[PDB]
Amino acid sequence: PVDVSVSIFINKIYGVNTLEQTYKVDGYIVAQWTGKPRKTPGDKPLIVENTQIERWINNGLWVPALEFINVVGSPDTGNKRLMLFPDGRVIYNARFLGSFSNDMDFRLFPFDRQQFVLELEPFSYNNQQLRFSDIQVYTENIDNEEIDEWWIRGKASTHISDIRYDHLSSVQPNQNEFSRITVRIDAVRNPSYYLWSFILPLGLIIAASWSVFWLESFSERLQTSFTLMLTVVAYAFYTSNILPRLPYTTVIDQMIIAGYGSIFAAILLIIFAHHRQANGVEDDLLIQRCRLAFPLGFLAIGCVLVI
Amino acid sequence: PVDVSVSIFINKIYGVNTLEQTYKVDGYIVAQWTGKPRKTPGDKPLIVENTQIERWINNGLWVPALEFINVVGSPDTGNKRLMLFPDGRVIYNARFLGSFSNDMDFRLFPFDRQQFVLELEPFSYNNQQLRFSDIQVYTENIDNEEIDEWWIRGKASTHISDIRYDHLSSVQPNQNEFSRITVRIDAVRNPSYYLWSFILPLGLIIAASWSVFWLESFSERLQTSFTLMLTVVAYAFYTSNILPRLPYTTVIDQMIIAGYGSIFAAILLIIFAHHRQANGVEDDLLIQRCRLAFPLGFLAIGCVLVI
Amino acid sequence: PVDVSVSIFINKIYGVNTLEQTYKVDGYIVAQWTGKPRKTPGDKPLIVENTQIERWINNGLWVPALEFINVVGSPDTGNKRLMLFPDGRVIYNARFLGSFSNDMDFRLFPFDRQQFVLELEPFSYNNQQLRFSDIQVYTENIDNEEIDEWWIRGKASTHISDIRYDHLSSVQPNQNEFSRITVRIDAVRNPSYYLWSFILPLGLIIAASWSVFWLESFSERLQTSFTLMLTVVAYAFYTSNILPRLPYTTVIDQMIIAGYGSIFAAILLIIFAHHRQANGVEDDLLIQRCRLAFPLGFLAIGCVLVI
Amino acid sequence: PVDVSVSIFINKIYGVNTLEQTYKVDGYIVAQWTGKPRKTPGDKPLIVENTQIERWINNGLWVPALEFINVVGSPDTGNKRLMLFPDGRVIYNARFLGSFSNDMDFRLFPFDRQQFVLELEPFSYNNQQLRFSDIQVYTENIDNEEIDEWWIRGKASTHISDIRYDHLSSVQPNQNEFSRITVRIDAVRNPSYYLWSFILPLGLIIAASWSVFWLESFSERLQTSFTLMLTVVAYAFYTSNILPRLPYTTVIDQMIIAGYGSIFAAILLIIFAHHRQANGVEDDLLIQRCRLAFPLGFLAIGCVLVI
Amino acid sequence: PVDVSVSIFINKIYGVNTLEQTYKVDGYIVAQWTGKPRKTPGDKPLIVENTQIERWINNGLWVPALEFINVVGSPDTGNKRLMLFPDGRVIYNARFLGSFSNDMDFRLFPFDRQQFVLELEPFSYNNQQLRFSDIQVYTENIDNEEIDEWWIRGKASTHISDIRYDHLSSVQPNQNEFSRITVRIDAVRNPSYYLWSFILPLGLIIAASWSVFWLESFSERLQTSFTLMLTVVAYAFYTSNILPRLPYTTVIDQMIIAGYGSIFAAILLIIFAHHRQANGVEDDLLIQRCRLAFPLGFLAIGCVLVI
């Protein structure tokens, strides 16, 4: 089994899609393995550029075809080169630009924390023909930087494992385990834009929804509740183009639900305090004292939403 | 007729478009067939990588060109390899990433159930020159998982059939039937986002539309109905970017129609109860008792919409 | 002149853009022509796959380069093959997936009827070197089916013509007429979505705009007219992302104009009935009897819009 | 210097983007130049198709590489051919489909007039090695036609010039002037859609904004002004997706500014006529006579905007 | 070390994305270096076009592979050529069209100033095998021009540096420093569109929000505040599609926050002046004199936002 020594240089991370859970990684990759000695012009190494590599593969040079597992679409390679040494070791350098994917959990959406993963694997050689001896990742350009609204925290984590495929078992009996290199990069979301853009106006709308009971006329109370309903609908659209259709509920979706519930409970209590009459002569003040109750109750609901 | 033994490994399913009825499938495909024996260096098999395959096809190796029938655009192949054995059998492995299409029925749209189909076929060899002997599908990565808002239920279904083309009948008389492999994967839509995002606010808007008759002044009644009309129009736009232009009506479109009908019937009954006078002196209470009738009637309409 | 016999199999039609007047057609194309006899291994035909065709064109095989005239961007060919016979006839089969365009007339937009056109032509051989003898179109998959909101009606129409180019006249004097194959497929738009989505709410808004004159207070009348103006503006945006910027007026644009005119005429008549005073003491009822006139007049306008 | 005789056939113009100032041109291009005589099979010309051209360029045939200067992205060539004559002249025909750009001036935006420009140039040969002798443009398909909302007026204008590059001056001293072919096609915008879609409702909104002073109650006057402000904001969004972010002001942006100024001046005059009191007892009619003044003044502003 | 002399001609800059912080640069690049003498047909130089370059690289010609470092996706090369001299010097000319990226600071967003950067680097040769001797940039087409809403100010700045990579240190010990060419182009944003489109209506909305206290009835005061809240929400959406999700706050986002705070403070003071009673009989004028205070206070807040 040939011992390949991979080394990855993450040049930049960008294009982080939350609706699609993809991200674009641009970088270089250097593989290195020892073969048999050869005769090079002079005694220096020999550099072979892009379209001259297959002229060497045709004459019997063994270059493995590494691939990225978690990629979305075939990656965009740029330049590539071989470096052949008279000592015998071959070095394959190549520039990649790929669109990768990972499982993201958005249950704390503005105050989020995910990781960007790169999974590299030989396409056709098992660990009985090719194994990765080590892996070195050089995130110098993204070490502690604010790429988008994403804080990259610390040094990347590397791992080498063996993955078994139940397909190819009829092709290679018991020699169907492949080496795999995994690179993980932790990232923390910067929640500031969602604070001054989504949390503050929705909180003020819920406060102004509590502030309906300080009116008098039944008609103004209902029309006020309906204008506030229209504002909540506008903010319900405006939060839909930042986050996918998740089965659970985030903070902002819970605030939209809280605004809807505030308006509906205010309408219900207003209609009830208008209809709770003897015949038509009664006026209610035992139930219009929720100027302090509804802030207390909905503060308790927000607190139990925090826990 | 050469007996080809295909084996498909679905790596991931993503990008499920409802507006376009497409979905992206990424995976591998392994074909395998026996030919004539050969001389391989040593006695092991011989692995031939991407650009070295056509150097073998030029020297007379028979590799068939399988294709995907239901694809949208030419698929994106990545790496590929041949494995030639001294026994005589050839194995062709290739990675595909395609954008497939299928006929979807959205008549129960949030509570939906579709299937993802892969149709594979030889491009140029009929069943008198090439037939598929078996098909094995390995959906281990998507066996019971929540890819998007889509539950993949159970193991995939495979089938092998013979399709006849009336074109090529002037080219090949009666030898114009092709083998075809079909793979079906059942998927169930997770309706939670449409519950807490579309059903609940539209239901509350219809309830608040019933709640107009508890006012008095004709003017406040009509202006209230018009603000509710504006809210229904906002939710009519907001449901248009989740679902295509279907000739039938889903649950959410029926709720939009129900909100429009609620507002229109309230306006009509309000104007009628304002104009049903002797000359100008009458006031009506025999028709303002629909505080209980309109919930009953529109509940009956919703119930008959359920059945 | 070589007599080429083309045969087209329309596999599917999709992606019909109304804003761009394009549509995507996926299918196969089979050309066939007789040459000189040859020696084939055995006595069967000989099938030549994708990258092996140019190895035969280099050795002097005459394969013409047909093209699609009305395409938008270079088409996406997939697989292709030659079938060479010892009798002498060559058959060229190829799979195409193209984005075609056609002149559409949207003057009856929801109740529309267009046709999808495919124009095929030799790129470099006039009708003195290559002519199309016949054309057969096999629309079995789209014979009477609802692809989108588009009904495909009946069998396709084929035609063979000769087109003259005034460029290349300095290149080929009087031998500059090319054969051309035209395929037309009639399609009828399914108007249901535009009925229950655009016609019904706009009609109800125009009815509710007529229903303003049943109020009293000048202020409520004007504020009601302005809320209805806001609703008409919302529906004016909501109809703009279904149809391009046409110089003429469709049904839905005429309904938007009718809603604007209804609101403006109501505002004008309301202000006039408020100002038509002696000094400040008069009230008008000779002009507030348009509760029946405005439905009659605007019904007459809608009727003359029908004719 | 070889005298090349270019001839361009504009097949269609489409995809005219105003936000990006690009347009897609699809057509053919025929270059023609005389070389040295040769031996052709028979005595006719010899047609060489797409992938057989480089087999002739490898054996020493001189084909120049013309390019399009003002293109956005590398153009999409389709088929191409050579026509070699025993007389000695070579003709190079090729189909192009490109996305070109030009400087557009939108200062009269609905009543606009631009031109579509094609700039062709040799990539590597100066006017001392290659010069264009003439240029013929055949716009028969777009001679007087309504492609989109764009009238193509008359025959195209052609020009041949010499462009000097200060780069390549260290490469070629004083032989760094290149021939250039320019084609200009005048186009006039059809303003009808912007008339019945943007000018008419904004004018009616400004008229209804003048119509606020015919009310009484200070509160209804301010709430009416605010509903009209909301309608102007809706039309301010609705005009933003038709035109880029220009530093100057078009007609529709000036109408939006006029609506804002109408609402603001009405609010200011209403508040002033409410506060211009003795202590709290005065009512003003010397300033509420702007029912005729504000149409006159804002008509004067619109007139001076015309000039 | 070979001394390469690069020369860049910026043909155009366009496609400036603020949401993605990319920009498209189209231009040419000329490298030049001296080698060993050769025999050219005649005594002139020898021009080698696109697909004939690799026929010379196969026979042992040394052409380096320069690359662009800060590019997003692999660049789009068009034509390219070699110019070989009998003196010995080789000139490599190529046309590039790339989508580059740079770190932009939007803290003064309408009154902005950024720079467009091009970073070029050899892919495989260190400064011990290849170094850049000089760099000349010819921005004649964009010298002082208004490409979009971006003023290009003056001549470009060039720099040549040496970059060290800690990856490839196990590959090349201490010979792992690469030459790098950097080109910077200063650009100033034209703030006019944001002045007459975003600053003026938001300022008028804040003024009209101050103008609420000149009313009387508690109900009209609250409904007026809520209509103004709805207008602020509309302008809060309308400013979101011009600028990314930045952690800091620009001028327009601060104006949106100021409008929200104006409405909330007005609602709070109105409710307080309605509830600051003895029991129910008091009316407050000591706190309704903020007709002059709120302009003063919020003018002070805007002034401290300026500093």
Numbering used by the authors:
A (entry chain D), B (entry chain C), C (entry chain B), D (entry chain A), E (entry chain E): 11 to 317
Text of the article:
For all structures, 10 mM cysteamine was used as the agonist since this is a saturating concentration of the most potent, known agonist of ELIC. Likewise, the agonist-bound structures were identical in both lipid conditions, deviating insignificantly from apo and propylamine-bound structures in POPC nanodiscs previously reported. Importantly, the agonist-bound structures showed a non-conducting pore with occlusion at 16’ (F247) and 9’ (L240). Thus, structures of WT ELIC in poorly activating POPC compared to activating 2:1:1 lipids exhibited no meaningful structural differences. Of the six structures obtained in this study, three others show evidence of phospholipid density at this outer leaflet site, including WT apo structures in POPC and 2:1:1, and the WT agonist-bound structure in 2:1:1. Thus, among agonist-bound structures, phospholipid density at this site was not observed in POPC nanodiscs. However, the structures of ELIC in POPC and 2:1:1 nanodiscs from the present study show no differences that point to coupled and uncoupled conformations.
